[PDB]
Amino acid sequence: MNTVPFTSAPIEVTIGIDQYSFNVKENQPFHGIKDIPIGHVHVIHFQHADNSSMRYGYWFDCRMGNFYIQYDPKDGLYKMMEERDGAKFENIVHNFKERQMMVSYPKIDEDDTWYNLTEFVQMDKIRKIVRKDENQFSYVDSSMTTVQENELSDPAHSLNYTVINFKSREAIRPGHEMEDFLDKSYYLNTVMLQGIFKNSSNYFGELQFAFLNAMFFGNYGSSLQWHAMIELICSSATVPKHMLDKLDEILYYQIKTLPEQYSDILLNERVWNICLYSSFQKNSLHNTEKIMENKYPELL
Amino acid sequence: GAMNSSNYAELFNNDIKLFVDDTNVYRVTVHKTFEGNVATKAINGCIFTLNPKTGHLFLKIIHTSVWAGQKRLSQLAKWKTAEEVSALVRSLPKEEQPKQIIVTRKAMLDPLEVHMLDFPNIAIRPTELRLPFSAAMSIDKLSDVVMKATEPQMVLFNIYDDWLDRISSYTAFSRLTLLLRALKTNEESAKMILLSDPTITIKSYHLWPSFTDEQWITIESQMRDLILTEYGRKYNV
Ligand SMILES: COc1c(F)c(F)cc(C(=O)O)c1F
Numbered sequence: 085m086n087t088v089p090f091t092s093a094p095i096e097v098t099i100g101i102d103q104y105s106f107n108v109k110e111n112q113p114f115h116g117i118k119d120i121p122i123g124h125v126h127v128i129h130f131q132h133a134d135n136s137s138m139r140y141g142y143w144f145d146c147r148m149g150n151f152y153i154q155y156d157p158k159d160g161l162y163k164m165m166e167e168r169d170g171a172k173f174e175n176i177v178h179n180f181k182e183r184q185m186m187v188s189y190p191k192i193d194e195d196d197t198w199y200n201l202t203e204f205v206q207m208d209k210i211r212k213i214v215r216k217d218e219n220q221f222s223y224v225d226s227s228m229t230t231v232q233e234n235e236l237s238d239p240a241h242s243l244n245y246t247v248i249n250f251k252s253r254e255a256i257r258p259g260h261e262m263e264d265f266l267d268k269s270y271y272l273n274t275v276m277l278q279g280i281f282k283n284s285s286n287y288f289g290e291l292q293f294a295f296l297n298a299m300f301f302g303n304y305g306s307s308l309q310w311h312a313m314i315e316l317i318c319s320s321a322t323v324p325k326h327m328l329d330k331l332d333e334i335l336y337y338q339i340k341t342l343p344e345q346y347s348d349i350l351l352n353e354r355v356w357n358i359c360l361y362s363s364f365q366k367n368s369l370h371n372t373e374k375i376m377e378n379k380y381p382e383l384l
Numbered sequence: 385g386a387m388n389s390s391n392y393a394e395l396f397n398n399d400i401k402l403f404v405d406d407t408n409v410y411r412v413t414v415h416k417t418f419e420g421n422v423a424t425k426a427i428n429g430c431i432f433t434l435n436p437k438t439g440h441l442f443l444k445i446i447h448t449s450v451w452a453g454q455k456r457l458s459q460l461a462k463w464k465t466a467e468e469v470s471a472l473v474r475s476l477p478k479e480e481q482p483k484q485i486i487v488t489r490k491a492m493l494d495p496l497e498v499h500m501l502d503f504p505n506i507a508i509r510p511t512e513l514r515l516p517f518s519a520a521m522s523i524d525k526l527s528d529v530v531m532k533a534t535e536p537q538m539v540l541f542n543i544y545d546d547w548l549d550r551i552s553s554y555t556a557f558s559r560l561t562l563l564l565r566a567l568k569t570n571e572e573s574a575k576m577i578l579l580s581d582p583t584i585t586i587k588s589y590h591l592w593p594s595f596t597d598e599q600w601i602t603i604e605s606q607m608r609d610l611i612l613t614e615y616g617r618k619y620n621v
């Protein structure tokens with residue numbers, strides 16, 4: 085069980101750690117989060133009480149180093165930092181735990197929610213979507229744009245999600261215009277799965293990361309990407325059977341975890357109605373269809 | 385964006401453009417089967433592809449053999465239309481290719497867009513105008529060449545005959561849409577108006593009668609009256 089100590093909390097801020105969140109007061113003696121489960125990526129995230137705009141945060145994996153948070157009064161944000169000196173870091177944490185100045189990652193044992201949301205998400209894949217190679221962790225925020233959004237302006241600050249575009253030469257084989265447009269299977273299976281992602285785990289990983297950035301940061305381009313990756317599968321007539329079953333589980337937990345009061349903006353009416361009710365896979369998402377009907381029947 | 389009453393003069397500027405109407409591509413007669421069910425029988429159709437500036441008409445005849453053994457024909461007809469329009473553009477020299485293609489029915493946008501991916505600089509536009517191009521098959525010589533076809537065929541016409549020698553493109557397009565609107569609203573009466581006089585004939589190389597300028601005024605007025613009469617019936621007003 086790993087720990088992310090905080091130097092201090094000089095400004096009042098709501099701190100999230102995965103799907104949990106805590107309110108910390110200005111100069112409250114808060115010095116970090118302990119008992120973080122090993123084996124999964126995690127995200128720590130922030131929303132300042134005084135500017136509820138720019139949710140921001142850091143994706144990390146404690147297996148990859150010792151990470152701590154420190155507030156920067158010049159740039160005005162809580163920053164993640166890697167500590168290279170293990171004895172320093174262990175001594176700092178030891179002290180902080182003894183003074184009981186850390187909150188505990190509040191995981192219920194029966195609960196697989198975080199695993200279910202991050203099953204296919206790897207740090208190494210995150211770091212290719214978010215390019216800042218001098219760090220082992222990845223910063224994301226509300227305002228960052230995606231490469232696709234950019235094409236339609238600062239490249240070093242972009243979300244390099246895989247570009248999906250149903251009316252592109254990449255998606256449409258010459259001579260199979262109608263076929264490929266009405267059945268996206270060649271674009272899913274050959275172009276995307278066999279060519280770019282190499283396997284369905286990496287595809288689901290990026291789908292899951294996109295959803296999490298949409299939920300935690302309100303990142304709109306990530307929400308576009310999540311929906312595009314769902315639509316590409318549902319709009320294919322030929323999908324490996326293990327993928328459809330996995331997809332139904334993935335989306336179920338995503339819909340389960342979404343704040344009830346955010347359905348209006350995080351859920352695209354067109355995509356969901358097409359996926360659950362009109363697409364080839366309209367009958368392959370029983371768990372997702374059932375939770376969506378009982379929780380958000382208005383959207384549909 | 386969409387073409388409407390606001391930007392109507394753009395049709396007659398010097399940027400090459402084409403209207404594409406797919407209404408008459410997939411044509412059927414619905415009928416009863418021996419067992420009392422209903423069946424369709426297809427007849428030959430056509431794509432109506434028209435340069436409104438010059439009157440050049442590219443009439444691609446769609447022979448019933450193209451539907452043989454195919455399902456969802458109304459959907460296929462849109463993609464066949466798009467395929468043939470794309471083939472037509474590819475066949476034109478670069479300086480003759482359109483800068484814009486305006487589809488009369490919005491359902492043609494995605495099929496034509498996908499078929500035109502190799503031409504990213506050609507804008508595919510819908511229109512808000514309710515154009516009467518479905519009535520193209522009320523033009524006898526167009527209807528005749530479509531029904532007589534035994535294979536896929538492209539036939540070239542100038543839908544304005546020689547009118548551009550005396551009038552502008554704007555005026556010629558307005559006359560065309562008036563004639564077609566009249567034929568669409570009451571074909572029998574419109575044809576009566578056009579051929580009533582046996583001394584006014586259609587040139588072998590034309591589609592419409594050889595009216596003098598003053599007879600065109602009379603004809604045009606008769607067409608507007610026919611359209612108003614029909615409209616008072618339609619709505620009882
Ligand atoms: C949280 O306090 C820490 C910490 F854990 C750490 F590893 C390093 C520093 C530092 O600035 O060097 C620090 F203040």
